[PDB]
Structure formats: C-alpha cells, structure tokens
Amino acid sequence: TQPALLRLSDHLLANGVRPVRDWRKPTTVSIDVIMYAILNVDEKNQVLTTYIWYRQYWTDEFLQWTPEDFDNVTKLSIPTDSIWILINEFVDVSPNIPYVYVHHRGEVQNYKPLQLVTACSLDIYNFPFDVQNCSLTFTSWLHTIQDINITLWRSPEEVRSDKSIFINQGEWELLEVFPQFKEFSIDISNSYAEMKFYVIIRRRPLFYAVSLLLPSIFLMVVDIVGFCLPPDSGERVSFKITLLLGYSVFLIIVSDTLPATAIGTPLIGVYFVVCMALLVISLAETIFIVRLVHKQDLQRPVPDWLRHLVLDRIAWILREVARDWLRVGYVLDRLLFRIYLLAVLAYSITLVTLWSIWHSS
Amino acid sequence: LLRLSDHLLANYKVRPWVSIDVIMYAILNVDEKNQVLTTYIWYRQYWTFLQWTPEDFDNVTKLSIPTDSIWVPLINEFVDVGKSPPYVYHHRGEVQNYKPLQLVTACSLDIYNFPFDVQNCSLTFTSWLHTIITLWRSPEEVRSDKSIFINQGEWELLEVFPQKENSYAEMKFYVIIRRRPLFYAVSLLLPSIFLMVVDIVGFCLPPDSGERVSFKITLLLGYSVFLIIVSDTLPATAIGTPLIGVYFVVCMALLVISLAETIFIVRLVHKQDLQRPVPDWLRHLVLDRIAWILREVARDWLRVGYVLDRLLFRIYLLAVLAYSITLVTLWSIWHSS
Amino acid sequence: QPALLRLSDHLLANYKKGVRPVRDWRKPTTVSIDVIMYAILNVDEKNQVLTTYIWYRQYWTDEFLQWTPEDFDNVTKLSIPTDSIWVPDILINEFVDVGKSPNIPYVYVHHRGEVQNYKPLQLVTACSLDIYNFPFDVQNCSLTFTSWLHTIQDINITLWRSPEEVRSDKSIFINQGEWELLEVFPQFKEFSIDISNSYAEMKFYVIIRRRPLFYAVSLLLPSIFLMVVDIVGFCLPPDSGERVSFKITLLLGYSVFLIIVSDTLPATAIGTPLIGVYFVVCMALLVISLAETIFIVRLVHKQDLQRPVPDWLRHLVLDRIAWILEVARDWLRVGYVLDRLLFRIYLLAVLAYSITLVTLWSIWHSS
Amino acid sequence: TQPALLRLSDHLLANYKKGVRPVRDWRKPTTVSIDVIMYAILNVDEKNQVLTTYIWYRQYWTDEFLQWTPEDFDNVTKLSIPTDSIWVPDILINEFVDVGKSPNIPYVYVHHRGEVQNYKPLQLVTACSLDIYNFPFDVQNCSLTFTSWLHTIQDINITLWRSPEEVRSDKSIFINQGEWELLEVFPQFKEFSIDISNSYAEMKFYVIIRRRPLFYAVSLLLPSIFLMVVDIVGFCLPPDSGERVSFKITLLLGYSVFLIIVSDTLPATAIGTPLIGVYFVVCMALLVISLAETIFIVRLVHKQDLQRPVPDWLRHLVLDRIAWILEVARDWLRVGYVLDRLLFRIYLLAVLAYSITLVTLWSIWHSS
C-alpha cells in the first residue's frame, strides 16, 4: 500500500513557484521535438494538423533525493500535483500522461505526445509538386531569459535529421525539423527567449499527377493532334464539341479539387484556364468556317482589315468562298495551332520546373 | 523565494471598501447556420494590498504566483470557449493576467452579396459580479491592425474599433471583417463564367439538329453537376442570394427553355407531312418580334424556330451582361469598403 | 448575508444525494418530461444517426426541499447547482453521442418542492433511416426516455403537457434546413423485463420530411430531360448517320453525370433509393441503343461482313414487328424493326419513371 | 431520521470505506461478474487503426459490507448509492485509446442481501487490427479486453454474468441497418501473469464484424461497371483512326473524375486494396495505352508520306499476333487494326478478371 518509494514520494511532496534556491540564477529548460505524422494541411484555413512527441526536461531543487534514502530508489513517478513552455502558433488541440518521471538528482523529464493544430503560411503556388515550411515555436512571456532560458536537449544536427520514428505514410513527407535560437524583445521585460522549429515538409505528387496532370496533358495532346489531321471544315467541329463538353465537367471537378488561398491559386491553375480558352476559341472559329464555306454570306471586309492581316501573319509566321475564304480559315488554323504549341510547351516547362523545385529541396 | 511566498500568503487573502487589451490572432470558420463567429484571441488584464519588503528579498521587483492565489477581475455573448490554454505576473503588486482566450461569439451575418460579403461583429466586455475597464493602448493602435495575424484565410481582419454604461461599464469592440473574393475565383466564379461562354458558343450551332440538342442537354448535365459540386462548398447549399441563386435560376431555366424549344422544333421537322397549321396569333407575334430584335409548312416552322432561337440568344446575352454588371458593381463596393 | 444563501446553506447542509427525495419510499417519484424540437441539424444515413437539437425539460416533486417562504423574505424560487441536488437518472436509449454541451449547471426549485429543471441537448440519436423514396423521404425517428436503474415503482415518467399539445408544437423549430418537422408524437409504455421488474418509458416519435426542391432541380430534372432528349433522338436522326454521334455525346455526358449522382445519392445497407433504379435503367438503355445504332452502320455501309441472318431470326423479327403493329435493304428493315422495339421500351421506361416520381411525391405530400 | 431509506443510506455509508475491498475477511477473491451488450458500431478508422463503438457495459458483484435486514428498515430492499461513496472494481480496458461523450450515470444499485449492480454506457475508442485488404467484402476481428488495474487474481476474479452462448448471440439492441454488421461477440477468459503470486485475470471479447458490400453498390460497383462497359462499347465502332480519340479522351477524363470522387469517399489507406488499387490501375493504364495507339495510328494515316516504311520486325509481329488474336498507309491501317484487336482482347481479359475477383470476394464473404 505504502512501500518505501511511496514514503519517499510523500516526503518529497508534502513540503508551483520556481524550484530554485536563488532567483538570480535562471531556470534553463531543455526541449526537444519528434515528428510522428503530418495528419493534414488545410490551405483554406491556413492550418496544419500534426502529431508531436514533446520531449521536455529541466532540473529542480525541492525534488532531489538519494537512493540510500529509500530502498536504493533513483527513479520516481510523481503525479503533476500543481508542480512548477507554450507554443505561439497554437490554435486548437491526446493520450495525456498524468505521471511524470523524475530522477534522484532533481531532474524532471517527460515525452508527452499530442495532436497539434498550428497556424501556417502555406504557399500553394506550386502544385502538386508543393513544398511547405511551418514554424511552430516555443517561448514564454513572463518567464523571461532571467527566469527561463530555453535550450535544446540535443545538438541541432541530430534533431534536424529526426526521421527515426516518422511514420512516412499518407500524403506528406517530412524533410527537416531545423531548430533555431533567437531572442524576442519588446519594450517591457526585454529578455524573452524564443526557440523556432521550421518543420519543412513536402507533398507527394503521384496521386495528383495521375488525376490532374495526366488528364490535362493528354487533353492538350489530343487537342493538338486534332488540328493537322481533320480538315478545317468537317468532322472537326464535332471533335471540338466533344472535347469541350468533356473538359467543361472535368474543369468543374478540378476547380472543386484544386486548393486555393488568398495569395493565389496554383500555377498550373493558369494552364487549365488557357487550355480551355483555346478550346472555346478553336471551336468557335471552326464553326465559323463550317458556316462560312459551305454556306456563304457577304464577302471579306476590305483588304485593309482581313486580307492584309492574314498576309502579314503568314509573312512573319513562315462559289465566292471556295479558295477565297478557305485561305483565311487555313491561316487562322495555323495561327491557332502555333498558339496551342506555345501553350503546351509552356505547360511542360512549368511542370518540369515545379518538379525540379520539389525534388531538389 | 519560499520565504517571500509565505510572507505574501500571510499578508494576502476576497477583494484586496482595470485595463483590457484584446488581439485577434486568427479568425476561424464563420458559421451561417449557427450565426456564430469562431476566432482565436489573446487577452490581457491589468489592475493596480500585495506588498513585500524589498531589501530582504533583494528587491526582486517581479514575481510568479499560482493562478488560484490572488483575486481576479467572463464572456457574455458566447456559446462555447474552445478548450483554450496560470503563473499570474510588479514591485508593489499590480498583477496582470495574460491568456490566449479564443472565442465562439454570437454575431450577425448578412451573406447577401456572397462572396463579397463584409461583416461586422460586436464584442461587449462587462463585469459579471461587481457593479460599476479602460484601454491599455491608444484607440488608433487597436483599430489599426494586430501585430500578429494569419491574414491568409478566406476572412480578412479589417478593423477593430473600440468604444458605454446593478450598473456596469462595458467595453465594446466593433470588429469589421471582410471575406476574400479571390478564394472563389477558381471554384465558383471561373466555372460560372465558362459555363456561360460555352452556352454562348453553342448558340452558334444550327437549330433543329442533333448537334445542338446534344450540346444543350450535356450543358444541362454540366450545370447540374456544377450545382451539386458547389452546394457543399458554399456556406448554404445554393444560398439563393443574388449572384448565386439568381444566376443559377436565370441560367438553368433559360437553358431548359432553349432545350425545350429545340426539342419541339426537332419533332416538328421530323414529321414531314400534313401538320397543324401555324397559329395566326403566333404568325403575327413572330412577324413583329423579328423586327423588335432586328414540306411547304416545314420552312415556315423552321423560320419561326429560328426567330425564337434568336430571341432566346438575345435574352441570354442580356442575362450575361446583367451578370457582368452585377459582378463589377459588387467588386467595386467590396473594394470601396 | 442574502436570504438566498442562508436558505440554501441549511436546505443543502443535511441534504443527501442518491436517496430518492420521498418520505414514504413505497410511493413513486413522478418525473414529468417535455421535449421541444428546435433544429434537425443532420440526418446521416450512412451511420444511421439523426443529429438533432431539443430543449429537454424535466419537472419532479422533491419532498426534501419544501420550505416556508414567510421566514425567508417571502422567497419562493431558489437556484441550486444541479450537482448539489438529486436528479432522476432518466436517459435516452438511442443516445450514442452528446455533441455540443451548452452546460448550464443550475436548477430552480419552488417553495412547495417541485423542481424546474431544463437544458438544451444536441443529440446524436441512433435511428432507422429508410431512404427508399429519396428525395421525397419521410423519416420517423424515436427518442425513448427511460430509467436505467430505478423501476416504475421508483420513477414514473409522464408528460408535463397534453399529448395533443406536444404533437402540434412547432413554434420553436426553425424551418431553415433540409428537413421539415411534421410532429413530435409522444407515447407511454411499461417496459417489462421480467415478472416483477418494470420500467416507465416515454417515446417521442419525431416525424420529419425532406425538402426535395434542390434534388428536384439537381437530380430529377437533368435525368428526365436526358430521358426525353434520348427518346427524341429517334425522331430526326434516322437509324443511321448523325445518330451515332448524338448517342455518343449523350453517353459520354451521362457517364460523368452518373458518377456524380452515385457519389451524391445517399446509400443505406438495406437498399438504395428507388429513384436510383431508373438511372441504371437509363444508362443500361443508352449503352444498348448506342450499341444498336453502331451495328446498323457497320451493316449498311460495310455490308461485306455477311452475318448469318438465320431464317428463324427473320421469322422472329417478323413476328415482333407484327405484334408491335443486296441485303442492305433487308438489314435496314431489320434495323428499323429493332429501332421501333427500342423506342417502345424507352417509352415504357419513361412512363414508369414518371409514374414512380408522381406516386413518390403523392406519398410525401399526403404525409 | 424518519425517512427509512435515508436512515438506511446513512447507516451503510457511516462506516463504509472506499479505499479497501468490501470483504469481511482479507485473503479471499471477489467475483466481479461482467456483461457487455453491443450497440451501434459508430466508426472504423483504418488509417488510425481505431474502432469506435457503443457498449452497454454492466458490472455485478457482492458487497458484504452493505448487509441489512429489510424488516428492520421498513421492509426496504432496493437502494441507490452515489458511485464515489462506494468501492467499485477498477476494471480497465486495454487496447483502449479514449472514451467520452457518454451519459455518466452516478448511481449504483444495491439489494438487501448485498449484491450490487452498476450499469454504464461507454463509447469506447479502442485500438484494433484493421486489414481492409479485400474491401468492401471485408471482415474485422477486433478485440476488447477487461483487466484488473492494480488487483491480482487473489483479489478480483472476472467472470461473465450470462452464459457465453448468450453473449455470443446478443444482437437484441444492435443498430443493424448501418454499414457494419456484427457477426458475433465471442468471449474468452485468460490469465496474464507477471509472477506466480502476481497474476491478473482478464476477460476479452472478440467482436467479429463484417462490412456490407451493398453499401458501396452505387458508389463503387455501378460506376466501375458502367465505365468498363462504355469503354468496351468504344472499342467497337468508333473504329480506330476516327472519332475514337475524342471518345477515349473524354472517357479518360471520366475515369479521372471517378478517381477524384472516390478518393475521399473510400475509407481506404495509402497501403491500398487490390480490388481498388488493381482494376483502377489496369483500367487507366489500358485506356492511356489505347489512347496513345489511336493517336499514333490516326496521325500516321492522316499525315501519310512517311519516308520510313513499315519495319520488317513490325511485319513479323503482325504475323505473330494476327493468327492468335483472331500501299504504306493501308499497311499502317492494318497494323493499327491488329493492335486495336490485341488491346480489345486484353481489355476483355481485364473485365473477366474483375468479375472473377468480385465473385471470389463475395464468396469468401459468405453468401446471404
């Protein structure tokens, strides 16, 4: 019921407040963090939900004992009976541990694990080849440096490569938990201490590559291969109609899929719009030709406005309608094909650039 | 230190016969069905009997005490706290209390001109038990901005104006927040724009043909999937607000009317035989409407179909113009607030 | 000291919880309940849970608290923390989650003994949700308040109001959701677990409807219009030609539409909604009809591949066409026969869909 | 004083001590009978490996400290006592994550002869071993275990309040119409010993539950069959080198929309499930290969005027494929047709394998 260790605990507990003989000396706190999993990242809310193994320890004075005191006991499990660090970016919160382990020499240590929902400045410009940088911090306000001096438990090298127990499952890959030490000072109690934890994470783009990038790349290739092969007037109109109708719904779904923030929508989100702006236009133009070749009405609006434009266009690029209007349609078709090639080339360059940025870091 | 603690515990006891500062860290999701605004708050309380001899303790000039030791100065318009996260913190007392408060505060919402909604909420702080609070910093500093804020969610913190009086004195904060339209510039506005551009393009197709009937029905299906998709994203499923419900009505109903007209004309062209004569009142109506817009009977039926199609096209162009003007005006109002 | 504090100090100093507040333990402690529905927050058919909001209201007569008001400044109402007063153990059987907890730990007591407890509950009530009629559902959930430990002889539950009054009470309910409250019909029962032990149970059946307008314009209008345009695809487009592309476009649009609706239609273990049977029967026809028209093409302009065209097949098609009413010409004729058969099947399917919709709406409206 | 039950409660609680076992003589075990009735199975999180349930836990035992003759106290026999004032077994659930959002009933029932009952709803969130391999035709043998926190067998002995067959066939209150069907609750009494003199008796129930594939008949089965059937329709006329490119690309976008839609709906894991991992990779892969083949064949046919002729090895492959599957531009057309037929045969094999896998899984899931 009450063995020797229980008697020792009673002795040490019967008799808050800093556990320091002298207030002049500071109460250094050793801190450490282990990243278990990145549960979720909400770009809409700009928050990050993750699992943190929170390692903490510091030395006291009123809890020191010796093994000879009671049955050679050096380790004790003391409940946190109102005994004597916070996160600035905490927004909402875990198998809480009620009993903390203490050593005979006065050291208190714990490894409380907890879910943590922090506030991050998520930049979604790159997508799905995304790479974030979250900076959950540790610091106290009234417990300034003179009172609490926050220091690392372990040297930065071994904590910045703390992949020992990372689950490495889900959507995100941790890369680095780089710690940093800096002092924040306002015009009151100028000696606050801050410990920064820049948890660098990264996205896994395989799912989005085969559901966002592949369909759009293949749609662009199909659009391009739909130019040279079908005649300027004929079954091309139905080809473009089917492509446009399919891409409209695909784009509705993608819009519902792409994450969006205040900074701006992803960079690929500009090539989804362009790749549609060149469908509609394309469709429109071919329809006009189909309705202005087999069906005739009026004539070309003066050379100054139509013939001159097409003449200059071909110059710097390289039965009154037959061979008189089909030429205009052909030149317009070639121009739109050139625009399509430029658009797909730019899309591929941005894809490779985003992938390189994601892979390098 | 312990001697100081015992000295103060013996000295101190019950009232010993206040300045408030509030900072909004981040505005969380705003619930329309609950009429409640959820936010993260940092709260600072200041108030000048707790005395100790300085020389004996080397003039500490500062101290940390358990929370349940000194008398402390609650929220009124709230339904929950949110499990928010105390070593109460001078040389002659004047203890102060810092704490991350958070808030789930009842508020009034308009949401009439979504996504350009701009909302205001009132946060009234007042004493609970003691009858008849002041600023800690100048009003301009509080209203200007918060040194800490995410400022990247769909809700932007625009203004916090501070300000009234069993009698109590109350501190009122008018917090004006402003929704960010750019959040919906790819999930709500781009689909609406291009689903109308596609329909405009489809109007160019010849009437009374399989091409256009299939085009229109597939566009109706696309509108339906778009509505299903944005029902959940919106705070209210098809809010019915102007620019959201009115757009869907004026566009889907017009597409349905056009599809019905196309189906009717297709049937009347298919039956190439004796057919019900074109009504005389319809004849005059089309004869004057064509001006207002500017086998033997098969051509007449095709002509009436074409003129009705052009009337529908003009109506839909008018609807697109109205939508564009509404969007421009609402964006200007939002940018002028 | 204020009179309230003086009264409460002595009224609760010797007050013991646990003990039923009755002088004669033989008599029961009638606990009258009342539930006012406030908002049907959600109805999840996947987990079979109705997330609702109610204003629970308990009244019982405590024999230990009655006091003379004359000696306490004519005070008749006293507020006491709930934890500091015996409360009945009445619990909801269907309860599987408490959700939000607008805790208010205080209860008013009259000088005669009667207690005035009430609190708001955001319940997650386990319920049997039948979605057969989606979107015209009519759910009939139940909330049974019963005493887990105390028997009927110990606690008897009744209504604070008349059953008719509770049934028609809809003032507090907010009609700003997807479900429209019809009634909260109360009933009483004596649950017999054995020969001797019996419990008092009060079942409030909450009957609610759907608002099918959103699904009547998002799920039932596109499908009906697709049925109608697919039918009219038989009119101007003949058995060959521009019908192939018409059907291809219809099919490719309907495939995505069906992916989305299947993702949208609620699904329960017992069975999918009846409407969801005329979507398959629609798609199952398109694939057939398309597969039909294509065939005719490859047997008119590509007639080199001579099919067996058995004599019994010709007799069968002749009999079928009779009942209804170069081999290129013969292939065209048999294609016309098959097209007429498919048109009749399409008409029957659309008639059945329309009759199903109108009878579902009639059932929903009459309820 | 006058209230009989008040006097009885005061008498019983005057001497009662909550810190000691209610045994008149030390050195004798106390039998803590247990009963578990299973209510709805709220959730099964496979990516967290947790099972969230709702149980009507019941404890029974004998407290020989609460002995009192009914005659001496006005023929009273039933009483209720606050839980905090009485000793209650510290039965704990291992493989247990968290608990809450349940109605805390604070009363414990007591009879004249001393027996005590304690009823307790519990929304247990317990760690399990969820395999989710053959989703949606899936069975989970989750487990609950009740142990004595700090009491050996010599003090507390765990036992069932009813016959094991009665507990196994207990589905009187289960909310059946949900996704999960509770096959059985099989109890088992085991002994976990850290020492000969330090042994704890444990009672573990095996909750064997199985998914309902009809739940995903519309979400997964119907789309996954309609898309396959539409693709097989496409493999016919439209013929290769024609309007098949638009058909195939729109079908690929439909597949991608399906994948996006079911990514969130499906309670699956990045580890994956063969029925969903495969037969969604073998469908999109075949669609992409057929789309590329159609693009290449149609481009070559339309452009023509290719300086490079049909390679000899290509002719050999055509010869070595044609016998079993069944002008330069015409030769390219023939090669395209042969490749199209090969892809069609592979797609027919893929759909046949999909059907066989579904039937096999439904058989292993045992018929209704």
PDB file of N, CA, C and O in Angstrom, chain B residues 93-127:
ATOM      1  N   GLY B  93       2.936  44.818  -6.423  1.00  0.00           N
ATOM      2  CA  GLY B  93       1.704  44.124  -6.803  1.00  0.00           C
ATOM      3  C   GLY B  93       1.331  44.386  -8.265  1.00  0.00           C
ATOM      4  O   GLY B  93       2.016  43.914  -9.168  1.00  0.00           O
ATOM      5  N   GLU B  94       0.241  45.124  -8.471  1.00  0.00           N
ATOM      6  CA  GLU B  94      -0.313  45.402  -9.799  1.00  0.00           C
ATOM      7  C   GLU B  94      -0.177  44.185 -10.710  1.00  0.00           C
ATOM      8  O   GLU B  94       0.419  44.235 -11.788  1.00  0.00           O
ATOM      9  N   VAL B  95      -0.749  43.069 -10.252  1.00  0.00           N
ATOM     10  CA  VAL B  95      -0.659  41.823 -11.001  1.00  0.00           C
ATOM     11  C   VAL B  95      -1.410  41.956 -12.318  1.00  0.00           C
ATOM     12  O   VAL B  95      -2.399  42.693 -12.425  1.00  0.00           O
ATOM     13  N   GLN B  96      -0.935  41.237 -13.333  1.00  0.00           N
ATOM     14  CA  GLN B  96      -1.563  41.206 -14.643  1.00  0.00           C
ATOM     15  C   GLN B  96      -1.740  39.760 -15.081  1.00  0.00           C
ATOM     16  O   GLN B  96      -0.969  38.877 -14.696  1.00  0.00           O
ATOM     17  N   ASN B  97      -2.770  39.526 -15.892  1.00  0.00           N
ATOM     18  CA  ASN B  97      -3.137  38.186 -16.337  1.00  0.00           C
ATOM     19  C   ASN B  97      -3.134  38.145 -17.858  1.00  0.00           C
ATOM     20  O   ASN B  97      -3.918  38.848 -18.503  1.00  0.00           O
ATOM     21  N   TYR B  98      -2.261  37.319 -18.426  1.00  0.00           N
ATOM     22  CA  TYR B  98      -2.182  37.104 -19.864  1.00  0.00           C
ATOM     23  C   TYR B  98      -2.723  35.715 -20.169  1.00  0.00           C
ATOM     24  O   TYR B  98      -2.405  34.758 -19.455  1.00  0.00           O
ATOM     25  N   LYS B  99      -3.540  35.596 -21.221  1.00  0.00           N
ATOM     26  CA  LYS B  99      -4.029  34.267 -21.564  1.00  0.00           C
ATOM     27  C   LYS B  99      -4.546  34.230 -22.991  1.00  0.00           C
ATOM     28  O   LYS B  99      -5.187  35.194 -23.425  1.00  0.00           O
ATOM     29  N   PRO B 100      -4.305  33.149 -23.743  1.00  0.00           N
ATOM     30  CA  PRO B 100      -4.943  33.004 -25.059  1.00  0.00           C
ATOM     31  C   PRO B 100      -6.406  32.626 -24.890  1.00  0.00           C
ATOM     32  O   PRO B 100      -6.735  31.490 -24.536  1.00  0.00           O
ATOM     33  N   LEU B 101      -7.293  33.587 -25.148  1.00  0.00           N
ATOM     34  CA  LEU B 101      -8.698  33.416 -24.797  1.00  0.00           C
ATOM     35  C   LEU B 101      -9.436  32.553 -25.814  1.00  0.00           C
ATOM     36  O   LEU B 101     -10.112  31.588 -25.441  1.00  0.00           O
ATOM     37  N   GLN B 102      -9.324  32.888 -27.100  1.00  0.00           N
ATOM     38  CA  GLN B 102     -10.175  32.293 -28.124  1.00  0.00           C
ATOM     39  C   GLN B 102     -11.608  32.759 -27.903  1.00  0.00           C
ATOM     40  O   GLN B 102     -11.903  33.389 -26.884  1.00  0.00           O
ATOM     41  N   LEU B 103     -12.506  32.464 -28.838  1.00  0.00           N
ATOM     42  CA  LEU B 103     -13.888  32.895 -28.692  1.00  0.00           C
ATOM     43  C   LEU B 103     -14.772  32.169 -29.693  1.00  0.00           C
ATOM     44  O   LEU B 103     -14.370  31.935 -30.837  1.00  0.00           O
ATOM     45  N   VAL B 104     -15.970  31.817 -29.245  1.00  0.00           N
ATOM     46  CA  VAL B 104     -17.058  31.376 -30.117  1.00  0.00           C
ATOM     47  C   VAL B 104     -18.219  32.317 -29.813  1.00  0.00           C
ATOM     48  O   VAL B 104     -19.051  32.047 -28.943  1.00  0.00           O
ATOM     49  N   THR B 105     -18.287  33.429 -30.539  1.00  0.00           N
ATOM     50  CA  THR B 105     -19.134  34.558 -30.174  1.00  0.00           C
ATOM     51  C   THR B 105     -20.299  34.679 -31.146  1.00  0.00           C
ATOM     52  O   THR B 105     -20.101  34.657 -32.364  1.00  0.00           O
ATOM     53  N   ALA B 106     -21.506  34.814 -30.607  1.00  0.00           N
ATOM     54  CA  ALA B 106     -22.665  35.065 -31.449  1.00  0.00           C
ATOM     55  C   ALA B 106     -22.489  36.380 -32.197  1.00  0.00           C
ATOM     56  O   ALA B 106     -22.045  37.382 -31.629  1.00  0.00           O
ATOM     57  N   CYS B 107     -22.835  36.374 -33.481  1.00  0.00           N
ATOM     58  CA  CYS B 107     -22.674  37.554 -34.316  1.00  0.00           C
ATOM     59  C   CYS B 107     -23.742  37.549 -35.399  1.00  0.00           C
ATOM     60  O   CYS B 107     -24.336  36.513 -35.709  1.00  0.00           O
ATOM     61  N   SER B 108     -23.978  38.726 -35.972  1.00  0.00           N
ATOM     62  CA  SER B 108     -24.972  38.912 -37.019  1.00  0.00           C
ATOM     63  C   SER B 108     -24.291  38.867 -38.381  1.00  0.00           C
ATOM     64  O   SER B 108     -23.272  39.533 -38.592  1.00  0.00           O
ATOM     65  N   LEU B 109     -24.858  38.085 -39.298  1.00  0.00           N
ATOM     66  CA  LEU B 109     -24.286  37.867 -40.618  1.00  0.00           C
ATOM     67  C   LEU B 109     -25.275  38.302 -41.689  1.00  0.00           C
ATOM     68  O   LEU B 109     -26.483  38.080 -41.560  1.00  0.00           O
ATOM     69  N   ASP B 110     -24.754  38.920 -42.749  1.00  0.00           N
ATOM     70  CA  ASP B 110     -25.560  39.354 -43.882  1.00  0.00           C
ATOM     71  C   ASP B 110     -25.545  38.343 -45.023  1.00  0.00           C
ATOM     72  O   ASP B 110     -26.607  37.907 -45.477  1.00  0.00           O
ATOM     73  N   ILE B 111     -24.355  37.975 -45.500  1.00  0.00           N
ATOM     74  CA  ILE B 111     -24.173  36.966 -46.541  1.00  0.00           C
ATOM     75  C   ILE B 111     -25.130  37.195 -47.704  1.00  0.00           C
ATOM     76  O   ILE B 111     -25.517  36.247 -48.395  1.00  0.00           O
ATOM     77  N   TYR B 112     -25.518  38.450 -47.930  1.00  0.00           N
ATOM     78  CA  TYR B 112     -26.445  38.745 -49.017  1.00  0.00           C
ATOM     79  C   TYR B 112     -25.728  38.835 -50.357  1.00  0.00           C
ATOM     80  O   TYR B 112     -26.287  38.443 -51.387  1.00  0.00           O
ATOM     81  N   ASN B 113     -24.502  39.349 -50.368  1.00  0.00           N
ATOM     82  CA  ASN B 113     -23.730  39.537 -51.590  1.00  0.00           C
ATOM     83  C   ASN B 113     -22.463  38.691 -51.568  1.00  0.00           C
ATOM     84  O   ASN B 113     -21.374  39.149 -51.915  1.00  0.00           O
ATOM     85  N   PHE B 114     -22.606  37.441 -51.150  1.00  0.00           N
ATOM     86  CA  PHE B 114     -21.514  36.484 -51.236  1.00  0.00           C
ATOM     87  C   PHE B 114     -21.042  36.382 -52.684  1.00  0.00           C
ATOM     88  O   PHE B 114     -21.863  36.455 -53.607  1.00  0.00           O
ATOM     89  N   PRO B 115     -19.729  36.222 -52.934  1.00  0.00           N
ATOM     90  CA  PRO B 115     -18.603  36.061 -52.000  1.00  0.00           C
ATOM     91  C   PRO B 115     -18.042  37.373 -51.470  1.00  0.00           C
ATOM     92  O   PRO B 115     -17.117  37.360 -50.667  1.00  0.00           O
ATOM     93  N   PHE B 116     -18.572  38.517 -51.889  1.00  0.00           N
ATOM     94  CA  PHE B 116     -18.044  39.812 -51.481  1.00  0.00           C
ATOM     95  C   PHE B 116     -18.613  40.287 -50.155  1.00  0.00           C
ATOM     96  O   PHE B 116     -18.622  41.492 -49.883  1.00  0.00           O
ATOM     97  N   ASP B 117     -19.084  39.359 -49.330  1.00  0.00           N
ATOM     98  CA  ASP B 117     -19.639  39.709 -48.032  1.00  0.00           C
ATOM     99  C   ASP B 117     -18.616  40.460 -47.191  1.00  0.00           C
ATOM    100  O   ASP B 117     -17.433  40.116 -47.166  1.00  0.00           O
ATOM    101  N   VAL B 118     -19.084  41.497 -46.501  1.00  0.00           N
ATOM    102  CA  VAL B 118     -18.306  42.211 -45.495  1.00  0.00           C
ATOM    103  C   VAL B 118     -19.165  42.282 -44.241  1.00  0.00           C
ATOM    104  O   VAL B 118     -20.281  42.811 -44.281  1.00  0.00           O
ATOM    105  N   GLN B 119     -18.657  41.742 -43.138  1.00  0.00           N
ATOM    106  CA  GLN B 119     -19.452  41.551 -41.936  1.00  0.00           C
ATOM    107  C   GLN B 119     -18.872  42.354 -40.781  1.00  0.00           C
ATOM    108  O   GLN B 119     -17.696  42.725 -40.778  1.00  0.00           O
ATOM    109  N   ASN B 120     -19.724  42.626 -39.797  1.00  0.00           N
ATOM    110  CA  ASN B 120     -19.318  43.288 -38.568  1.00  0.00           C
ATOM    111  C   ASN B 120     -19.859  42.507 -37.381  1.00  0.00           C
ATOM    112  O   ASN B 120     -20.976  41.983 -37.427  1.00  0.00           O
ATOM    113  N   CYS B 121     -19.059  42.429 -36.324  1.00  0.00           N
ATOM    114  CA  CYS B 121     -19.455  41.770 -35.091  1.00  0.00           C
ATOM    115  C   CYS B 121     -19.156  42.694 -33.921  1.00  0.00           C
ATOM    116  O   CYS B 121     -18.249  43.529 -33.982  1.00  0.00           O
ATOM    117  N   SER B 122     -19.942  42.551 -32.861  1.00  0.00           N
ATOM    118  CA  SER B 122     -19.773  43.335 -31.647  1.00  0.00           C
ATOM    119  C   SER B 122     -19.329  42.413 -30.521  1.00  0.00           C
ATOM    120  O   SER B 122     -19.956  41.378 -30.277  1.00  0.00           O
ATOM    121  N   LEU B 123     -18.239  42.786 -29.855  1.00  0.00           N
ATOM    122  CA  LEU B 123     -17.727  42.073 -28.689  1.00  0.00           C
ATOM    123  C   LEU B 123     -17.840  43.012 -27.496  1.00  0.00           C
ATOM    124  O   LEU B 123     -17.102  43.998 -27.408  1.00  0.00           O
ATOM    125  N   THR B 124     -18.763  42.717 -26.587  1.00  0.00           N
ATOM    126  CA  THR B 124     -19.050  43.581 -25.447  1.00  0.00           C
ATOM    127  C   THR B 124     -18.524  42.907 -24.186  1.00  0.00           C
ATOM    128  O   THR B 124     -19.007  41.838 -23.799  1.00  0.00           O
ATOM    129  N   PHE B 125     -17.538  43.533 -23.549  1.00  0.00           N
ATOM    130  CA  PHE B 125     -16.961  43.040 -22.307  1.00  0.00           C
ATOM    131  C   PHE B 125     -17.525  43.847 -21.146  1.00  0.00           C
ATOM    132  O   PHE B 125     -17.547  45.081 -21.198  1.00  0.00           O
ATOM    133  N   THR B 126     -17.976  43.153 -20.106  1.00  0.00           N
ATOM    134  CA  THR B 126     -18.565  43.816 -18.953  1.00  0.00           C
ATOM    135  C   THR B 126     -18.312  42.978 -17.710  1.00  0.00           C
ATOM    136  O   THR B 126     -18.092  41.767 -17.786  1.00  0.00           O
ATOM    137  N   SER B 127     -18.344  43.644 -16.559  1.00  0.00           N
ATOM    138  CA  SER B 127     -18.200  42.948 -15.291  1.00  0.00           C
ATOM    139  C   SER B 127     -19.414  42.061 -15.036  1.00  0.00           C
ATOM    140  O   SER B 127     -20.532  42.356 -15.468  1.00  0.00           O
TER     141      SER B 127
END
